Amino acid sequence: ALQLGELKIAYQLAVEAESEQKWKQLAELAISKCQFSLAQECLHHAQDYGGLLLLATASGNASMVNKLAEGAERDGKNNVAFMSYFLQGKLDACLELLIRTGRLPEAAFLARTYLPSQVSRVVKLWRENLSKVNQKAAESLADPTEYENLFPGLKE
Amino acid sequence: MVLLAAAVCTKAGKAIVSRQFVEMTRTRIEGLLAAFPKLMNTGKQHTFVETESVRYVYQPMEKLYMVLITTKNSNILEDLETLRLFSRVIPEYCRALEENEISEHCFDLIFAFDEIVALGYRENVNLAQIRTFTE
Amino acid sequence: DRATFYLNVLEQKQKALNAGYILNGLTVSIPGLEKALQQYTLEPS
Amino acid sequence: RTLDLPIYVTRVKGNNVYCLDRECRPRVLTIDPTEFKFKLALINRKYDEVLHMVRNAKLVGQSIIAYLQKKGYPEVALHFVKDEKTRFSLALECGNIEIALEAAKALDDKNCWEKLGEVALLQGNHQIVEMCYQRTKNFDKLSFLYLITGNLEKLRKMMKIAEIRKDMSGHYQNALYLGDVSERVRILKNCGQKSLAYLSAATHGLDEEAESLKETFDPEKETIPDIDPNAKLLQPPAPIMPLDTNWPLLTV
Amino acid sequence: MDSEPPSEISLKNDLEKGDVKSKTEALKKVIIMILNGEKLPGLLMTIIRFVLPLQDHTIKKLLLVFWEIVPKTTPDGRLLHEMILVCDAYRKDLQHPNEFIRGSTLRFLCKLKEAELLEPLMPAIRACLEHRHSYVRRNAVLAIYTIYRNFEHLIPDAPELIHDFLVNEKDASCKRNAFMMLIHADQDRALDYLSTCIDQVQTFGDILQLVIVELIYKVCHANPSERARFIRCIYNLLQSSSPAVKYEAAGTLVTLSSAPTAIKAAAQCYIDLIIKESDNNVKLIVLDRLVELKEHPAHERVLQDLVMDILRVLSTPDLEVRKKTLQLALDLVSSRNVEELVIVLKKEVIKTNNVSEHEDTDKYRQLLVRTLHSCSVRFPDMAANVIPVLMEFLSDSNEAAAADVLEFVREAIQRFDNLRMLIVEKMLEVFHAIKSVKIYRGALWILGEYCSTKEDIQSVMTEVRRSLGEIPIVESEIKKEAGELKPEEEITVGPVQKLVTEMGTYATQSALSSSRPTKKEEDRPPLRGFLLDGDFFVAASLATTLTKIALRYVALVQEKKKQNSFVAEAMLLMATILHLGKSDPVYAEAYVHVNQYDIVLDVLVVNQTSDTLQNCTLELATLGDLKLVEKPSPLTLAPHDFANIKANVKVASTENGIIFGNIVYDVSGAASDRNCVVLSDIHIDIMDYIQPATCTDAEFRQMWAEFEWENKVTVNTNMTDLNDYLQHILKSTNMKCLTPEKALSGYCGFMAANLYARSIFGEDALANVSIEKPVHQGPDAAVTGHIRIRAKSQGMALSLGDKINLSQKKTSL
């Protein structure tokens, strides 16, 4: 079915639930023919979060890119995750990926960027995290005194 | 070097005669040969046996082991072939292996070792070739 | 076999039987004190 | 002090301690102001007293030159910092990693630069993180960080030096993060990922670049995937004028 | 002179004597003592003086020999110069008409990476530029390469001298004999030239071309060298599902297991794999290719199955090959393992058919019945096959032979409810000649459960009930059993009710019925009569009685997970169980410091005294398994010197003959009676010497059995679990907490660790740490743990016993 170039027949033969090895071979074949459509479905069934994202995050509306990177957020596959959510000026779960991983500073930083002034809460949670994670001279528990700066220090 | 040393052993617990191509395995030569060749190189009557991360190739002759040691390798046929040629050369010098007669012809055997394997790369030898040197 | 019985009576059944059965959980027989006489003859043989 | 024989202390009456063994040969020993003065001084937070106190009858390795790197709010730590490791340690315990990078440098090691860079992001400032992360070669982590940080100039630098690595979750990121996607289109072209390059480009309305990729490679751009292939991509990149590489700080 | 390190005075004498033989022998004796590693510089002037110019090869060859193994070290008769006494008159040696002396000289000279001989080795290529033998040309390419290696990576070694300076490697390719010392870093033109040479080869030489440049477009072109590379290249061009059918790999492979059965067993494995790639369920593992030897046409002559029959084994070839073979029958053909295991088991299990498969040892017979029977429990189809074969097992009609047979089949009935009704009548038959427990137990259970089906039972049971043999366990089994199934469906002179009467008497009551039972007093102390006595609510009838129990199976019973099963074929299993699968005053002060992961014992050496201690040396010693990684090296301990001296420490070594105490540290000084003193730095223990090793549950269990561990102590501060203090402390007495021996629940749940070590003490060390952490209203002693300990004569047992309490040291100088 791959040889014939019968994508559909190869697709039934894989069978939508699992047989990921079949689907990865099909997905590549689908990208070759530049039939992106069959490819997105093959990659989904394959799973292939890293690869699947690359085809998928080319959306500009993030239409089917969040799912295949939902995990990535909290798996420390943050990079895969950021591309998914930030793609049309939206913060879909951009911030959230950063909180999940423990890369709290980065959520604060993002919050400042697009300023809905969410920063005040993120900086706090983060600052608290510095005090627990042995910093005393950059301890952060202040509003601008102990290193980092909560939202009134910050600005648009 | 690929071939650390080419060594004739007695399983008395010592390297009877041995050759260090370039200064590396001096005293080291005796300890390896002394422990491992006693157990048949830890063999089971197999020409290749590897122990303590050193390849030992051998042939038993009496209470003695003629031993080739490598810890790296370029080809299968080659390691055996230098040992083999060595085994044509060794009874010409010592009438089989035997510690006292091996001991007496340290010079003979040692010279053959340098000639046979040069800087760890297995050259070839022959009993007539050996003659020009000890002449 | 014993287990299927014993288990089923504990697991499945009322344990009227199980309860009744344990009176302390005693041995299968109560003889005399056998060892001492045995020992008397056995030692200087 | 050590004697040259095994012994039993006879007892302590006075400064001396007196000893006798099984055979009963004596040893006496004056209680010194060596080890005793040094730590009597360190306990009462004196470092100035303690420098004199440092002698080679009591120096050891870790009671003077590395035991004094054992405060989570550095005090003792500040005083002995001579070892490139003790210096590294000192820095995370403050949370100011400016010293870390140098110790990390002098430890000649990448791992230290990425870990201090992470601590750096924690004190809040990403300039310091960039430098570290750049030399550990985590251009892709940086690429990810960078819109989060709100830089666009720095974000481009990462994209190129991650292009060459073919880090598809590094070079790939930045194009999304700026309002136009063109960065990806070329990187992907070099990857040979013509499909991916077209989809990305096309959606932003850079159909012309998308077409270039199709024409150089296998065409067919018409196909509509589970994602859009031509719907607007535009994002307003970072509304902040001062970025989070320029995250404010005072530091205590 | 095998190895005699003091003999150097005699060698000097022997080295010049006016007799050439003596001189040769002497120089030879020097060589043999150096090679072992012993004293040699005293001699040097004597050695060097006779031999130097001469074309007389033997002494020259001998001296030439001694210059590649120690030239640098020896300096009495040589000293340091550019044209040393290694090469000054060996320019003559290089330029003699006899090839041997020149050749030899060239060969050692260029071999050295010496910089005090760099110039003399360079035009030393002259000696072999003319090639009187294959040896001369090979000697030359290797010597130019060795010159290149010795600091001449540039223009001193690269072009030609008059024919070679790094160009023999080019020349060799087109010359009659090849050999390429060109493996790395050498002329591109020669590399290219070797490729051309693949065709015009010299076979030894081809192995040299080939280490450098491999992969051919051809099939070959000839010779072992090309051939050896070729199988590597073939595996590339078809990686897919192993090699399957081994290529030129086969030749070396046999020798790889010359000891002797293991080769066949291995060979059998590959041959089975190769046949087919099946489903690959539980023990159906055959990989390789699906069709390449098929299985099972009906027109194939004389068929595939003939080779398949070998693999079905009783031992039909020898035991190593047997274990491999049983797995291999299972692997090509079954459903999982079950199908081919039933066939295989039918052959193995005891019958009246063949007396080469029956034996009067009861356990093996029994086990074989259970193996056959487990296949049914696994898979249904097998139930139908098993029951008639089981009746054949019975037909042996020895007391014991019946007995084993009855015991499994009765379990099968618990699984297989009113399906095996048919068997009961067969099963009774051999129950009458009786000398054992087992027959009574089993028979009484079949005949008991099966009562609806038959009606014989007073008659069958009664001969046995008044017969003797061994009857302990008989009681237990008859007690739960005799009444069962349908309330009044038998009768011979005792209906099912007489049976319930009997069943009760046999359990522990008394009653005239079946001419009284053999015994009444039950088996092991816990079991007793009473449960069942209470029972039989509805007289032997499927309801909620004995019958229920009998026609039901305790927990899950499926597969070969050992739930009414036994896991393949009984003989193969013994081998698998066996497989453990084990994986002058002196003062010191000191502390241990770690900076940048360097572990060092800091020592400060103090002379509080005004007296002289000059002659001061500092040493850290190797005691046994403790070692110095570098002693403290300062010459300190002088009048009123305070010094910090660092002695690096290791924990792992090999036993030295000196004392085995704490740490020995030695300072030396002035004094002539006690020039060396031993004085101490802080504590290190005997425990270091133990070596950590680990066990799995099987190795632990085996060792438990192997040697006693009754010895126990209770150790305080084992309040905590295995992971915390106990692991850390156990680690320091080189032990490790591995697998469990626990049984946790709501009443159980002491933490159990299985420990192992293999001490360098001639013992292992094992222990179980049981942490008595309350999971009951009445704990042992509350929190604390009792460590049950051993070692192989329990001399390290004790170390485990106390080094799991506490352990800490610190100082702050």
Swiss-Prot record, chain A:
It is found in: Cytoplasm, Cytosol; Golgi apparatus membrane; Cytoplasmic vesicle, COPI-coated vesicle membrane. WD repeats lie at residues 99-136. Disruption phenotype: The knockout of the gene results in early embryonic lethality with no viable embryos recovered at 12.5 dpc. Disulfide bonds: none annotated. It comes from the Eukaryota. Belongs to the WD repeat COPB2 family. The coatomer is a cytosolic protein complex that binds to dilysine motifs and reversibly associates with Golgi non-clathrin-coated vesicles, which further mediate biosynthetic protein transport from the ER, via the Golgi up to the trans Golgi network. Coatomer complex is required for budding from Golgi membranes, and is essential for the retrograde Golgi-to-ER transport of dilysine-tagged proteins. This coatomer complex protein, essential for Golgi budding and vesicular trafficking, is a selective binding protein (RACK) for protein kinase C, epsilon type. It binds to Golgi membranes in a GTP-dependent manner. Oligomeric complex that consists of at least the alpha, beta, beta', gamma, delta, epsilon and zeta subunits. Probably interacts with PEX11A. Interacts with SCYL1. Interacts with JAGN1. This is Coatomer subunit beta'. The gene is Copb2.
From Swiss-Prot, chain C:
Coiled coil: none annotated. Oligomeric complex that consists of at least the alpha, beta, beta', gamma, delta, epsilon and zeta subunits. Interacts with ZNF289/ARFGAP2 through its C-terminal appendage domain. Interacts with EGFR upon EGF treatment; interaction is essential for regulation of EGF-dependent nuclear transport of EGFR by retrograde trafficking from the Golgi to the ER. The coatomer interacts with KDEL receptors; the interaction is important for retrograde trafficking of KDEL-bearing proteins from the Golgi to the endoplasmic reticulum. Interacts with COPB1. Interacts with TMED10 (via C-terminus). It comes from Mus musculus (Mouse). The chain holds residues 526 to 570 of 874 of the full protein. This is Coatomer subunit gamma-1. It is found in: Cytoplasm, Cytosol; Golgi apparatus membrane; Cytoplasmic vesicle, COPI-coated vesicle membrane. The coatomer is a cytosolic protein complex that binds to dilysine motifs and reversibly associates with Golgi non-clathrin-coated vesicles, which further mediate biosynthetic protein transport from the ER, via the Golgi up to the trans Golgi network. Coatomer complex is required for budding from Golgi membranes, and is essential for the retrograde Golgi-to-ER transport of dilysine-tagged proteins. Belongs to the COPG family.
Curated annotation (Swiss-Prot), chain D:
This is Coatomer subunit alpha. It comes from Mus musculus (Mouse). The coatomer is a cytosolic protein complex that binds to dilysine motifs and reversibly associates with Golgi non-clathrin-coated vesicles, which further mediate biosynthetic protein transport from the ER, via the Golgi up to the trans Golgi network. Coatomer complex is required for budding from Golgi membranes, and is essential for the retrograde Golgi-to-ER transport of dilysine-tagged proteins. Xenin stimulates exocrine pancreatic secretion. It inhibits pentagastrin-stimulated secretion of acid, to induce exocrine pancreatic secretion and to affect small and large intestinal motility. In the gut, xenin interacts with the neurotensin receptor. The modification Phosphothreonine is found at T30. The chain holds residues 562 to 813 of 1224 of the full protein. It comes from the Eukaryota. It is found in: Cytoplasm; Golgi apparatus membrane; Cytoplasmic vesicle, COPI-coated vesicle membrane. Oligomeric complex that consists of at least the alpha, beta, beta', gamma, delta, epsilon and zeta subunits. Interacts with SCYL1. Interacts with JAGN1. Interacts with TMEM41B. Interacts with SVEP1. Probably interacts with PEX11A.
UniProtKB/Swiss-Prot annotation, chain E:
It is a peripheral membrane protein. Oligomeric complex that consists of at least the alpha, beta, beta', gamma, delta, epsilon and zeta subunits. Interacts with CAPN8. Interacts with SCYL1 and PRKCE. Interacts with COPG1. Interacts with ARF1 (myristoylated); this interaction is required for binding of COPB1 to Golgi membranes. Interacts (via trunk domain) with ARF1 (via switch I region); the interaction is direct. Interacts with KCNK2 (via N-terminus); this interaction increases the channel-mediated whole cell currents and promotes plasma membrane expression of KCNK2. Interacts with STX17. Interacts with TMEM115. GO terms for cellular component: COPI vesicle coat; COPI-coated vesicle; cytosol; endoplasmic reticulum-Golgi intermediate compartment; Golgi apparatus; Golgi membrane; plasma membrane. The coatomer is a cytosolic protein complex that binds to dilysine motifs and reversibly associates with Golgi non-clathrin-coated vesicles, which further mediate biosynthetic protein transport from the ER, via the Golgi up to the trans Golgi network. Coatomer complex is required for budding from Golgi membranes, and is essential for the retrograde Golgi-to-ER transport of dilysine-tagged proteins. The lineage of its organism: Eukaryota, Metazoa, Chordata, Craniata, Vertebrata. GO terms for molecular function: structural molecule activity. The modification N6-acetyllysine is found at K479.
